[PDB]
Write a protein that binds this ligand. Structure first.
Ligand SMILES: *[C@@H]1O[C@H](CO)[C@@H](O[C@@H]2O[C@H](CO)[C@@H](O[C@@H]3O[C@H](CO[C@H]4O[C@H](CO)[C@@H](O)[C@H](O)[C@@H]4O)[C@@H](O)[C@H](O[C@H]4O[C@H](CO)[C@@H](O)[C@H](O)[C@@H]4O)[C@@H]3O)[C@H](O)[C@H]2NC(C)=O)[C@H](O)[C@H]1NC(C)=O
Ligand SMILES: *[C@@H]1O[C@H](CO)[C@@H](O[C@@H]2O[C@H](CO)[C@@H](O[C@@H]3O[C@H](CO)[C@@H](O)[C@H](O[C@H]4O[C@H](CO)[C@@H](O)[C@H](O)[C@@H]4O)[C@@H]3O)[C@H](O)[C@H]2NC(C)=O)[C@H](O)[C@H]1NC(C)=O
Ligand SMILES: *[C@@H]1O[C@H](CO)[C@@H](O[C@@H]2O[C@H](CO)[C@@H](O[C@@H]3O[C@H](CO)[C@@H](O)[C@H](O)[C@@H]3O)[C@H](O)[C@H]2NC(C)=O)[C@H](O)[C@H]1NC(C)=O
Ligand SMILES: *[C@@H]1O[C@H](CO)[C@@H](O[C@@H]2O[C@H](CO)[C@@H](O[C@@H]3O[C@H](CO)[C@@H](O)[C@H](O)[C@@H]3O)[C@H](O)[C@H]2NC(C)=O)[C@H](O)[C@H]1NC(C)=O
Ligand SMILES: *[C@@H]1O[C@H](CO)[C@@H](O[C@@H]2O[C@H](CO)[C@@H](O)[C@H](O)[C@H]2NC(C)=O)[C@H](O)[C@H]1NC(C)=O
Ligand SMILES: *[C@@H]1O[C@H](CO)[C@@H](O[C@@H]2O[C@H](CO)[C@@H](O)[C@H](O)[C@H]2NC(C)=O)[C@H](O)[C@H]1NC(C)=O
Ligand SMILES: *[C@@H]1O[C@H](CO)[C@@H](O[C@@H]2O[C@H](CO)[C@@H](O)[C@H](O)[C@H]2NC(C)=O)[C@H](O)[C@H]1NC(C)=O
Ligand SMILES: *[C@@H]1O[C@H](CO)[C@@H](O[C@@H]2O[C@H](CO)[C@@H](O)[C@H](O)[C@H]2NC(C)=O)[C@H](O)[C@H]1NC(C)=O
Ligand SMILES: *[C@@H]1O[C@H](CO)[C@@H](O[C@@H]2O[C@H](CO)[C@@H](O)[C@H](O)[C@H]2NC(C)=O)[C@H](O)[C@H]1NC(C)=O
Ligand SMILES: *[C@@H]1O[C@H](CO)[C@@H](O[C@@H]2O[C@H](CO)[C@@H](O)[C@H](O)[C@H]2NC(C)=O)[C@H](O)[C@H]1NC(C)=O
Ligand SMILES: *[C@@H]1O[C@H](CO)[C@@H](O[C@@H]2O[C@H](CO)[C@@H](O)[C@H](O)[C@H]2NC(C)=O)[C@H](O)[C@H]1NC(C)=O
Ligand SMILES: *[C@@H]1O[C@H](CO)[C@@H](O[C@@H]2O[C@H](CO)[C@@H](O)[C@H](O)[C@H]2NC(C)=O)[C@H](O)[C@H]1NC(C)=O
Ligand SMILES: *[C@@H]1O[C@H](CO)[C@@H](O[C@@H]2O[C@H](CO)[C@@H](O)[C@H](O)[C@H]2NC(C)=O)[C@H](O)[C@H]1NC(C)=O
Ligand SMILES: *[C@@H]1O[C@H](CO)[C@@H](O)[C@H](O)[C@H]1NC(C)=O
Ligand SMILES: *[C@@H]1O[C@H](CO)[C@@H](O)[C@H](O)[C@H]1NC(C)=O
Lengths: 453, 102, 129, 111, 132, 132, 53, 53
């Protein structure tokens, strides 16, 4: 009776916390169009479907979004994949050359400036002895003045030769389902009210995560995952200011964005099999690209998020907003890709408010760069191919990324500002529900049986 | 906002006499650090976040505390161990203490 | 090693603008924040602001806005990527602004927080006529 | 939760006409083998609520040839071809994906 | 619907209960432990790490008495200096997550004792067959 | 210091002695037999060659009578045409390296006989349970 | 009368190295462990329908 | 063994194209001297005396 022996049980449900690599798995609709249509047509497997998302009881694991892994390796994976869709494409060594630019044919004022420059320049042919003369159009943010005449050059041609993206491939988002291999498990906090930190009371295991699309956006993350019922804010430590504040609200705000200009692409042969898609002529009215949001829904959602912000900050507090304080281009404004072309669209018009302790729309003008320098790499650029026609796209604004000014000296106003910074804070808004655990079977337990001879 | 107050403030002890400073926060839930500024020289963090001392720091400085109440115990001091001490919450700075050689 | 070299001390007339260049070397400059802090005599320390050089995202203290500006410059070569320069421009001078200024970096350990500094520039004396 | 959003809620429906009661879920209700398990609930006042259909399109034995389900992913609409006085009362959606399941908000058929 | 009883039979679904769920679920976690151009290298090394992990456990059972029984039994008496607990309370109250921490202070004491007991018993069995 | 007796229990420490050292050390050599950008490919193929080699040996014990006993015993009589030696002189005068060469002129005669004896024993055992 | 090569408007061309040859060589395919390869040894057999040997 | 070059160099970057840097030798400051090495006489005369033995 009290002569207890021991038995080792194999396969015991128990785990620890660990860090492993994962494995992407995308749906077959990206495999309908084939042969390097977009990325993850050869990098991810087609999905084993319908994951075994079952429930679990009487259980509590502490979570963390901040020192969580699988967000680090995703920020490695997306960059590492992003490089692999460029090496089959053209390099622009023969194009960093003296330009002869002039203004586009347009009624120009003396003060306000056109954003298009009609530039002619020498170029090689397919042959080597002969050479050709050709012209294209460029925005104000890709030429600088080298120093009568007024000759320019491209901006990145003193640091890195540029890679044209192939116009065959596209940059549209696609769902990625991460999966854990055999010998691991992925938990999911199914609780409603959970600020991403501290113990979740109702976890549930899963085989593979649900749809996680990748977007690129600094302020005002787009097409995101909606909050469940309320409006939630999340942070690491709110009285610290050096960490951002993730706001995930409930109802999406529809945003329309467009370029009303009608373009033309113009193929220029550089050498054997080298095709440079420049911008041709502009048919119609030279007009400025812009975006619209709805007035009343935005004024409503700010009234929601102020009601949610006042919990952590005292009830009687004046709360205001401001434009971003400065820096480089794509952290003051907000950036996004809309059908294969990048915008940089001013957001002074959304954050001009103050909030007391008691048919129209908002237009906001954009700019269009053609070369990008995403993730701020030392040897990288990407000339975007100019796309045809009048362009527009419709999206859902889902959350914000904010930053408190942490000033000293007796503040009653707590002014807030948008800010992009790292790209990883976009990602942490999507993987806050999960963690990854490692199964360790072969437990051990005292009981009452004796093994015979 | 958050107010910091060192204690006792200006102190006066001979070399060899071990001591302890204590700086009080206005409200809690946070964890302070400390600094050691010599006569007209570069300031120097000697202990971070509660009890973790930095690189190039001997273990004779031991800091501790909880609540709104944080202690810094200095033991086996030298005439060169003494200088002016500060304590920091996130960006806020106390006015400092000084332990005069008697 | 981690090295932070500032510029030299300077006499400035009242109402001018002063530039102070903190140059960092010995680490990957695109990763860590650069904070600016001031020591006024007989006031204790006073925080000023911070910058992240990856995109130049800045943030200022409250009681100095409209007066301070921060820029940065990276190293753009595959040979020597380590060194970086952070410029502070400080305008609207008063005779109270006579102090000594410091550029600092976050402590390098992973468990170290965002504010507790390890490395310090040698300090720059600014004195107003 | 995976709570169901019902549209429309109150339906005064005349006798003989059609009726459409849709639900929209937060996620897909795709059970992990492919076969979703939806349920539509009858309810009269004074009666225990009982089943019409237990799938997208597979009904209870005893339900007549007038009630049908349709939809895909999140949008799932019930369709009654001819409405009688037996059909009046509160209707519901239901899940088969994973516990805890969510009943809806109740969709009342009236005259 | 699928019902409540399926997640009792699901992978890791038994983990919230006491031992009684673990007395019937042990085939499932044993089952799902095994079955799983630059990317293929990383998934290949993930797969071989998985099976190299599994075969260590089958080896570590092989050097004990339990070959593949999945519920073995052995012949070391339980020293009450570790547990200090009654019988049914660790068979009706504690969970296996809760049971993990109380035996996490000490490991390979038990495993060394099991190796010693099996290494002794095989020698005594060879001595039994030696006069046979 | 660490002493002399520690290397008796080290990896391959019993190789220099007679069988009496190797009669107890057999868990250690069994243990260390398993646990271990183009360089990743070469070490990956080394690792899978290692575990394939291990699993061939577990298979070759599986087709014999002893699954995971690690001290087998079986039922072919030792033909004295090979040994031509007294008993304890191959238990106290020889080493396993020395035992290797004296059975290296002929091999797989023994491995051929063991498969046949185990298959015959399984046949007679199937007949014994078949009448049962 | 000046010419050009035919493929220069579509693709730059690769000279083969004169060290390597293009002569045929016997290749024996093999199935890995866990498969098998059958061979119809019949004489009169049109490659479609069941082979009896 | 001590080995040295006593000359004093300067490197000079020449940009060849985009992202290219040919680090040529700049100017030589001081005395144009020859690189050389030193070893000790007695230790070498000893260590040959060992290896002959
Ligand atoms: C947030 O989420 C929304 C919802 O998905 C995104 O909106 C989609 O954006 C993509 C691209 O950004 C759109 O895809 C493009 O649609 C164009 C219009 O074609 C549609 O309409 C015609 C006419 O009815 C249909 O026949 C056709 O099937 C499409 O449904 C296409 O012209 C585009 O194709 C171009 O690129 C391909 C590349 O292979 C070329 O081969 C083509 O010749 C052509 O040049 C492209 O397919 C999509 O339509 C948008 N959805 C909706 C509902 O409008 C937002 O973009 C997203 N926001 C962010 C920031 O990502
Ligand atoms: C901002 O807020 C976050 C959370 O709101 C806060 O993060 C937490 O900080 C503590 C440090 O105070 C981290 O460390 C842990 O602390 C617990 C007790 O809370 C202990 O189990 C551990 O530390 C103990 O052991 C040490 C050994 O020497 C002792 O010296 C020490 O005093 C403790 O007794 C453990 O390390 C904790 O991990 C985080 N939380 C998370 C989720 O990461 C953060 O510190 C706040 N920022 C600032 C600047 O205060
Ligand atoms: C950008 O600048 C170039 C300058 O090289 C412009 O190209 C030239 O534009 C002029 C008029 O815009 C063209 O002249 C016209 O030619 C037609 C046909 O020969 C003739 O009928 C007209 O009377 C007039 O002479 C000229 O052909 C054209 N040259 C080339 C090589 O294209 C170009 O139009 C400018 N583009 C923009 C958008 O401003
Ligand atoms: C936040 O709001 C302020 C207030 O408008 C913005 O500051 C304004 O910035 C613009 C451009 O930076 C200044 O325009 C001027 O343009 C002339 C054109 O040559 C130039 O020479 C001047 O040096 C200056 O750049 C404008 O004066 C300035 N307003 C004030 C009151 O100083 C700020 O840009 C807004 N923030 C963002 C992120 O947009
Ligand atoms: C072409 O563009 C240039 C540069 O934009 C114009 O030159 C000056 O432009 C600035 C602002 O764009 C004006 O304030 C100056 O008055 C312009 N100088 C002169 C002499 O015009 C130029 O005017 C544009 N148009 C032409 C026909 O060259
Ligand atoms: C393209 O190449 C032609 C051919 O050299 C350039 O024309 C010469 O330009 C220089 C400087 O402007 C003059 O000194 C020569 O007299 C020009 N040659 C002739 C035959 O007139 C031309 O400048 C280059 N660039 C463009 C934009 O056409
Ligand atoms: C997120 O919620 C959790 C719990 O709901 C908070 O964690 C506790 O918060 C209280 C009050 O702030 C502290 O007294 C406890 O010590 C916290 N628990 C632990 C383990 O530290 C957490 O503060 C919330 N975070 C935010 C940013 O709101
Ligand atoms: C943008 O410009 C192109 C220029 O080609 C327009 O395409 C022409 O459209 C008209 C009317 O549909 C057709 O008759 C022509 O045959 C089209 N041209 C070609 C080459 O196909 C296009 O319609 C314009 N789009 C907008 C929105 O203005
Ligand atoms: C963004 O653009 C879309 C274009 O489809 C707008 O949707 C339609 O807008 C018209 C306005 O003339 C309405 O009459 C339609 O009913 C809308 N369609 C739907 C399905 O609602 C959308 O309203 C625009 N949003 C904003 C804020 O301007
Ligand atoms: C973003 O929008 C704001 C508001 O439209 C711009 O601020 C205006 O800038 C002009 C200078 O071009 C001033 O004359 C106006 O007085 C400013 N408006 C206000 C309300 O102060 C701002 O310039 C835009 N951002 C950028 C980068 O141009
Ligand atoms: C933005 O969010 C809205 C939320 O309603 C989405 O609208 C619904 O999306 C589902 C999913 O396909 C459709 O079945 C519904 O018909 C949509 N309802 C309405 C009223 O449009 C919308 O799809 C999201 N995306 C965009 C680009 O607007
Ligand atoms: C080799 O030449 C360099 C040339 O710069 C010498 O570096 C200078 O050394 C003097 C002596 O202290 C300094 O005052 C200068 O400031 C240095 N120049 C620079 C640019 O830093 C170097 O000393 C010479 N080597 C030797 C051994 O004398
Ligand atoms: C090689 O160079 C080293 C440089 O340190 C010499 O070491 C020192 O040389 C000086 C000669 O002026 C001696 O006085 C020191 O005592 C040496 N240091 C030590 C630690 O012994 C070394 O002697 C040189 N070797 C030769 C063979 O010239
Ligand atoms: C490239 O040119 C721009 C414009 O003159 C200049 O600001 C930048 O410093 C240059 N880059 C380098 C690496 O010199
Ligand atoms: C290349 O040149 C030949 C000869 O003129 C021509 O037939 C062919 O169409 C050209 N190729 C292309 C892609 O135009």
């Amino acid at each position: 009776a009290e002569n207890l022996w021991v038995t080792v049980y194999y396969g015991v449900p128990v785990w620890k916390d660990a860090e492993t690599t994962l494995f992407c798995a995308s749906d077959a609709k990206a495999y309908e169009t084939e042969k390097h249509n977009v990325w993850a047509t050869h990098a991810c497997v087609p999905t084993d479907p319908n994951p075994q998302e079952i429930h679990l009881e009487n259980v509590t694991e502490e979570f963390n979004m901040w020192k969580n892994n699988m967000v680090e390796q995703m920020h490695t994976d997306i960059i590492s994949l992003w490089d692999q869709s460029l090496k089959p494409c053209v390099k622009l060594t023969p194009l960093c050359v003296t330009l002869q630019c002039t203004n586009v044919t347009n009624n120009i004022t003396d003060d306000m400036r056109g954003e298009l420059k009609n530039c002619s320049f020498n170029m090689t042919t397919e042959l080597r002895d002969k050479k050709q003369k050709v012209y294209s159009l460029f925005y104000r943010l890709d030429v600088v003045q080298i120093n009568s005449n007024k000759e320019y050059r491209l901006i990145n041609c003193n640091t890195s030769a540029c890679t044209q993206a192939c116009p065959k491939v596209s940059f549209e988002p696609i769902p990625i389902h991460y999966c854990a291999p055999a010998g691991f498990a992925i938990l999911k906090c199914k609780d409603k009210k959970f600020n991403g930190t501290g113990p979740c009371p109702s976890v549930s295991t899963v085989q593979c995560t649900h749809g996680i699309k990748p977007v690129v956006s600094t302020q005002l993350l787009l097409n995101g995952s909606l909050a469940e019922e309320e409006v939630m804010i999340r942070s690491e430590n709110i009285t610290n200011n050096a960490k951002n504040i993730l706001v995930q609200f409930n109802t999406p705000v529809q945003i329309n964005c467009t370029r009303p200009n009608n373009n033309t692409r113009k193929s220029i042969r550089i050498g054997p099999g080298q095709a440079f898609y420049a911008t041709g002529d502009i048919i119609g009215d030279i007009r400025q690209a812009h975006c619209n949001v709805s007035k009343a829904t935005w004024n409503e959602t700010l009234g929601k998020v102020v009601k949610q912000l006042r919990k952590h900050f005292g009830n009687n507090t004046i709360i205001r907003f401001a434009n971003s304080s400065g820096g480089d281009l794509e952290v003051t404004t907000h950036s996004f890709n809309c059908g294969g072309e990048f915008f940089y669209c001013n957001t002074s018009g959304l954050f001009n408010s103050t909030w007391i302790s008691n048919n129209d729309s908002i237009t906001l003008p954009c700019r269009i760069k053609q070369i990008i320098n995403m993730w701020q790499r030392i040897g990288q650029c990407m000339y975007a191919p100019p796309i045809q026609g009048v362009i527009r796209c419709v999206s859902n604004i889902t959350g914000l990324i904010l930053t408190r000014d942490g000033g000293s000296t007796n503040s009653t106003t707590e002014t807030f500002r948008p800010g992009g910074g790292d790209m990883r804070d976009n990602w942490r808004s999507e993987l806050y529900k999960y963690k990854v655990v490692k199964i360790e079977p072969l437990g051990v337990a005292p009981t009452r049986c004796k093994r015979r001879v | 906002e958050i107010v910091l107050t060192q204690s006792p403030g200006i102190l006066s002890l001979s070399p060899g006499e071990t001591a302890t400073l204590f700086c009080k926060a206005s409200q809690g839930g946070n964890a302070m650090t400390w600094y050691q500024k010599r006569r007209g020289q570069v300031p120097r963090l000697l202990i971070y976040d509660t009890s973790r001392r930095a690189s190039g720091v001997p273990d004779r400085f031991v800091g501790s505390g909880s609540g709104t109440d944080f202690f810094l115990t200095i033991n086996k001091l030298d005439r060169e161990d003494f200088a002016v001490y500060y304590c920091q919450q996130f960006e806020f700075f106390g006015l400092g203490s000084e332990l005069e050689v008697h | 090693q981690v090295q932070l070299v500032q510029s030299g001390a300077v006499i400035k007339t009242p109402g001018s603008s002063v530039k102070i260049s903190c140059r960092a070397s010995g680490y990957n400059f695109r990763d860590y924040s650069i904070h600016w802090v001031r020591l006024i005599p007989d006031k204790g320390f006073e925080w000023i602001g911070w910058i992240k050089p990856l995109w130049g995202a800045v943030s200022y203290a409250r009681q100095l806005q409209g007066r301070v500006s921060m820029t940065r410059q990276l190293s753009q070569d595959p040979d020597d990527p380590d060194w970086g320069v952070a410029y502070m421009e400080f305008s609207g001078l008063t005779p109270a602004d006579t102090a000594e200024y410091f550029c600092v970096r976050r402590g390098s350990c992973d468990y170290c927080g965002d504010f507790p500094w390890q490395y310090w520039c040698q300090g720059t004396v600014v004195v107003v006529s | 939760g995976v709570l169901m959003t019902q549209s429309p809620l109150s339906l005064p429906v005349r006798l003989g006409d059609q009726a459409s009661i849709s639900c929209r879920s937060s996620q897909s209700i795709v059970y992990s083998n492919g076969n979703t398990y939806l349920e539509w609930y009858l309810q009269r006042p004074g009666q225990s609520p009982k089943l019409l259909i237990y799938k997208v399109s597979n009904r209870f034995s005893g339900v007549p040839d007038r009630v049908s389900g349709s939809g895909s992913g999140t949008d799932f609409t019930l369709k009654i071809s001819r409405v009688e006085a037996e059909d009046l009362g509160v209707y519901y959606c239901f899940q088969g994906s994973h516990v805890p399941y969510t009943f809806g908000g109740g969709t009342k058929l009236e005259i | 619907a699928v019902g409540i009883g399926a997640v009792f039979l699901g992978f890791l679904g038994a983990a919230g209960s006491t031992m009684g769920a673990a007395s019937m679920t042990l085939t499932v976690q044993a089952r799902n432990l095994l079955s799983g151009t630059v990317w293929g290298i990383k998934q290949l090394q993930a797969r071989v790490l998985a099976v190299e992990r599994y075969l260590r456990d089958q080896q570590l059972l092989g050097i004990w008495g339990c070959s593949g029984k999945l519920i073995c039994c052995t012949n070391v008496p339980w020293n009450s200096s570790w547990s200090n607990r009654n019988l049914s309370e660790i068979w009706d109250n504690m969970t296996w997550l809760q049971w993990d921490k109380e035996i996490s202070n000490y490991t390979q004491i038990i495993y060394g004792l099991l190796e010693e007991s099996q290494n002794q018993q095989e020698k005594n069995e060879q001595d039994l067959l030696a006069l046979d």
